[PDB]
């Protein structure tokens, strides 16, 4: 298996771990803050997914410092993981185009 495909699969597994850990740590950080809505794990996981994908509907958002720091990690992990997937697709296309050119 080539590196870029192994790295993509590794990034996908790492992203799932960030989503699960991010959902657990957000609830742990948001409870205790009056008005916080990111205080139950099922919707916290939904919030983490729409954060890593950078969709950000606005139905859920962190208000505490550590809840927002968790959000930052989720954002970077999601942007990086999907970016590595795009990078792997580019390598696949470039490698196929080299063979298409004989070189």
């Amino acid at each position: 298996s080539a590196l870029h495909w192994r790295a993509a699969g590794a990034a996908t597994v790492l992203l799932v771990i960030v989503l699960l850990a991010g959902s657990y740590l957000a609830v742990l950080a948001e409870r205790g803050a009056p008005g916080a809505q990111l205080i139950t794990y099922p919707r916290a996981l939904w919030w983490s997914v729409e954060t890593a994908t950078t969709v950000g509907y606005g139905d859920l958002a962190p208000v505490t410092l550590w809840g927002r720091l968790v959000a930052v990690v989720v954002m970077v992990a999601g942007i990086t993981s999907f970016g590595l997937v795009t990078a792997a697709l580019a390598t696949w296309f470039v490698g196929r185009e080299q063979e298409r050119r004989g070189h």
Partner: antibody
Amino acid sequence: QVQLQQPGAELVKPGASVKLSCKASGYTFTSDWIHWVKQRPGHGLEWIGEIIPSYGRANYNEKIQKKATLTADKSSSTAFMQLSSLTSEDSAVYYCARERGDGYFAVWGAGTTVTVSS
Amino acid sequence: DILLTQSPAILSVSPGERVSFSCRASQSIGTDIHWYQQRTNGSPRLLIKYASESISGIPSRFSGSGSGTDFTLSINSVESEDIANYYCQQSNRWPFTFGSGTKLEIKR
């Protein structure tokens, strides 16, 4: 089997302190929160605080006077609420409840009738 | 914090009649309301979770409705075992808050 086990009663002198217990059994997950609810005779339910035993962080109701300290012991699966400087206004029934991190209190304890008297 | 008003405090119903309990929230909480039953000298018992979801072991006559700020707990054909206090509790915003409570009494 009963999931949350609390003592029957505790007699506390005015100003003295007491520590209540709540032995947990059944399924226990890392997403468990133990809550404490206060109910005076002739009153509704009053949320006191919460604690996650898999991490040890405790939150408290900021509307009321803070007279509690929530601890947890994972080796014996027992949460503790330490009440300090008790007056007659603190005499109530104190329940413990287990929340699976999804909002509601699925199971309650029998409650410990705390009577502050001389 | 979120305020949960339950009015009226006492509901008088003759046997075998439907009875509805009211729980109004100071602000919208979607469907994050939960109902509990407490008989005399008893511990609270979960009846309905998330406004309208059933609980295993709870009789079929118990149901719930509503979303937003107004929530209803309905009991089809009230019986003597249903004589207790009924509380609502919200889980949308921290901290969790309870309602003042509504007592059910039967006119036999």
